[PDB]
Design a protein around this ligand. Structure first.
Ligand SMILES: */C=C\C(=O)Nc1ccccn1
Length: 299
């Protein structure tokens, strides 16, 4: 194995203004102003529910380890941590929130070019995690964030593992998981391919809930019997046949992210041929030195 020469950047609490809450685990939107640099970087800041929980701190630093270890345009990178009473994670602000909330809010304005372009960008992000021997284990629309409508990134490395992997319980999302994941707590790049299939299905159904109202104890059995999620209305058989390939029992019979990139990107060249949508053709404070995390490099 190669050595992980990732830099973990420690930040002074004075270097960022929390600006607003985004969630409650609690998450703030903020500005980061690196020491005498004359730039302001919109950031997301996360800290613990209870400061002095040793179990909680092990968790967030594991998240930090992984996020420090990734540099790809379709993956969230750690900017730094702050070692206050409550440890603060600092990442790139994704202003438009999670892609699940986004498809739901904007279903009447989302066209095929966007949907297929997302499918590609997620396939690229996941393919990069695979290059880096990394297994996400919690890929879902809820865990893909929207920097712009044209640009999404994979997030929430809370469950992510460097290198099969054999786990041991914990509240885990059954409806996104490969069969071999539910049965034998096995996880691979190919089990992430399954979750990718469910993620694409989330998008193509404009955020609808998989196996809606079916309790998760049943799921194992249903999939054994041969059942899968339905063809979404907008989906040509071309797009749906791709999703179905992600839900094969033989993990190695499933497609590879590098292939999914290729297949979705061919379809993105002629989007109205692959996704049929009603009327598809139709579809900040006083801060001067602001710069997106993506243009802010340090050696
Ligand atoms: C891409 C880093 C990231 O996860 N940012 C983030 C998280 C939550 C809300 C907004 N932005």
């Amino acid at each position: 194995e190669a050595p992980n020469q990732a830099l973990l950047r420690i930040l002074k609490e004075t270097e960022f203004k929390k600006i607003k809450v985004l969630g409650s685990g609690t998450v703030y939107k903020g500005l980061w102003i690196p020491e005498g640099e004359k730039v302001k970087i919109p950031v997301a800041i996360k800290e613990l529910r209870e400061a002095t929980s040793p179990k909680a701190n092990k968790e967030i630093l594991d998240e930090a380890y992984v996020m420090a270890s990734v540099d790809n345009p379709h993956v969230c990178r750690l900017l730094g941590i702050c070692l206050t009473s409550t440890v603060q994670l600092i990442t790139q602000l994704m202003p438009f929130g999670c892609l699940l909330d986004y498809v739901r809010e904007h279903k009447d304005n989302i066209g095929s070019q966007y949907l297929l372009n997302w499918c590609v960008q997620i396939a690229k992000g996941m393919n990069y995690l695979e290059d880096r021997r990394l297994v996400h284990r919690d890929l879902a629309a809820r865990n893909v964030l929207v920097k712009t409508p044209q640009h999404v990134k994979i997030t929430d490395f809370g469950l992510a593992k460097l290198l099969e992997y054999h786990a041991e319980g914990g509240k885990v999302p059954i409806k996104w998981m490969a069969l071999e994941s539910i049965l034998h707590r096995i996880y691979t790049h190919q089990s992430d391919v399954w979750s990718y299939g469910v993620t694409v299905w989330e998008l193509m159904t404009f955020g609808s809930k998989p196996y809606d109202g079916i309790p998760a104890s049943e799921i194992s059995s249903i999939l054994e019997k041969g059942e899968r999620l339905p063809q979404p209305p907008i989906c040509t058989i071309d797009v749906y046949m791709i999703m179905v390939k992600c839900w094969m029992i033989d993990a190695d019979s499933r497609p590879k992210f590098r292939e999914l990139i290729i297949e979705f990107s061919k379809m993105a060249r002629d989007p109205q041929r692959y996704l049929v949508i009603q009327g598809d053709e139709r579809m900040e404070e006083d801060m001067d030195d602001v710069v997106d995390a993506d243009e802010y490099l340090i050696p």
